[PDB]
Amino acid sequence: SPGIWQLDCTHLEGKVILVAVHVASGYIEAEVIPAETGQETAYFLLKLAGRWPVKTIHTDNGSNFTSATVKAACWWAGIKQEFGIPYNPQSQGVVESMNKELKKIIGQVRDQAEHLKTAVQMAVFIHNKKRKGYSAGERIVDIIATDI
Amino acid sequence: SPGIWQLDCTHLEGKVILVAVHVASGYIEAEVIPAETGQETAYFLLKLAGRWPVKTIHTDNGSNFTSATVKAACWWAGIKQEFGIPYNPQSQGVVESMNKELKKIIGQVRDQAEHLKTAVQMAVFIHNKKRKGYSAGERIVDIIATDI
Ligand SMILES: Cc1nc2c(ccn2Cc2ccc(F)c(F)c2)c(-c2ccc3c(c2C)CCCO3)c1[C@H](OC(C)(C)C)C(=O)O
Ligand SMILES: Cc1nc2c(ccn2Cc2ccc(F)c(F)c2)c(-c2ccc3c(c2C)CCCO3)c1[C@H](OC(C)(C)C)C(=O)O
Incomplete structure (x- = not known):
């Protein structure tokens, strides 16, 4: 389904990274948040839902x-x-794989910026534009356009 | 051109709202920023460029x-x-119109939230989903998918 997103937090350098994965494409939206709180997750969801057609949220x-x-x-x-998380063999391991890839890219570009949040956004950019053939960015826009 | 975005700041309640308009669709991305600084604009652009294929930025x-x-x-x-801003009769008044519409929606929903940033994201959501026929959200995804 094109409306499913998985949201999880990962911890790095004493900071919290909220990672949203569009399950059908592997596209990511991420933000470095001041703390793992309900108010931060709520605000993040309002932003995400205004940018993409979010129908369902999953989490670990x-x-x-x-x-x-x-x-x-x-x-x-x-x-x-x-x-x-309902059993779906088509998306098996997709969210874990996208989070693993993002974490690897952050490590790879980390010394190119002072702030972790800068490295995170560089990592999101690299991830979304990487051709796997199409990129996750090309895939989400095709999936949503065709669903409209 | 599908890669053109216009970025401007507007001031409300002693806060700064950075508004990015995708000129071809009227789609908006906005954030409430702690101050009108180069570092905030830089960080916002890195996020935007990792989410959409940004080729050119305009501003007033x-x-x-x-x-x-x-x-x-x-x-x-x-x-x-x-x-x-190069003369383009096709997009004449589009950015001003989108900013005017966003400001009106913020005013309309402002009493539904404590924080201005919450009202801003509610306003972005309403704006992007409003059918004008298609919505700005439907238009950006169609414009970018067809450009790919
Ligand atoms: C914090 C920050 N400062 C930056 C810069 C760029 C110049 N400066 C000023 C400066 C001057 C003298 C220095 F010795 C010094 F180390 C940095 C970026 C920055 C901005 C954009 C950007 C990159 C960098 C490093 C890397 C590739 C992706 O795009 C930063 C940056 O922080 C913000 C993005 C919040 C501005 C950072 O984390 O380093
Ligand atoms: C700051 C904030 N608090 C919220 C809420 C919701 C419950 N509460 C707790 C609460 C408890 C008792 C109250 F008397 C009281 F006024 C609010 C939203 C919130 C969250 C999501 C949301 C909306 C609201 C009001 C309006 C429609 C769009 O979605 C808020 C909210 O702030 C964050 C989004 C940062 C959490 C706000 O600005 O009011």
Whole structure:
């Protein structure tokens, strides 16, 4: 489904990186957030939902979607709650692979910037433009355009 | 051209809103930034360029693209410098109209949130999904997919 995104946080240098993966394409949106809080996740979801047609959110940590602020963002944006991760052999290992690739790229470009957030955005850019043939960026735009 | 974006800052409640308009579609990306600085504009451009294929940036304030940090972001992302705004009757008034519409929507939803940044993201969501027929969100994905 083109409306499914998986959101997870990863920790690096005492900072938190919120990583959203568009499951059907492997496209990533990421932000360095001041703390792993419900208010940060809610704000991130409102931004994401205004940029792409988000129908469902998945995660490897269900408790991060329990706060009143996150429930309010999903209610307002019309995003449906997902219990666990439904078995889908087509997307098996895709989210883990995209997160592994992003982490590797961050490590590879880290010394090119002072701030971790700068290295993270360089890594998102490299990841989204990398041809695998099409790139994740080309794939998401094709998937969504064809779904419209 | 599908690679042209116009970036400008607007001021509201003592805060700064950086508004990026995809000129061919009217699609918007916006963020509330802590101050009108070169480092904030540079970071915003790196994020934008990793999400969409940005070729050229326009603005109504040329001096905001003179810092070493902004020049570095454009160099790394391969974004070309534009002197003034070239005459294009097809896009006449589009950026001004999109900014006017965003400002009106912010005013309309402002009392639904505590934080201005929340109202801004609600406004971006409403703007991008509004059918004018297609929405700006549907138009950008069609323009970029067809350009690929
Ligand atoms: C924090 C920061 N400063 C930057 C720069 C560029 C110039 N300067 C000024 C400067 C002057 C003298 C130095 F000795 C020095 F080390 C840096 C980028 C920057 C901006 C864009 C960019 C890159 C860099 C390094 C790398 C490739 C992708 O695009 C930075 C940068 O921080 C912001 C993006 C927030 C401005 C950083 O983290 O280093
Ligand atoms: C700051 C903030 N808090 C929120 C909420 C929701 C619950 N709460 C807790 C709360 C509890 C008791 C209250 F009396 C009270 F006023 C708010 C949103 C929020 C989150 C998402 C959202 C909306 C709201 C209001 C409006 C529609 C779009 O989606 C907020 C919100 O701030 C963050 C998004 C940063 C969490 C805000 O600015 O109000």
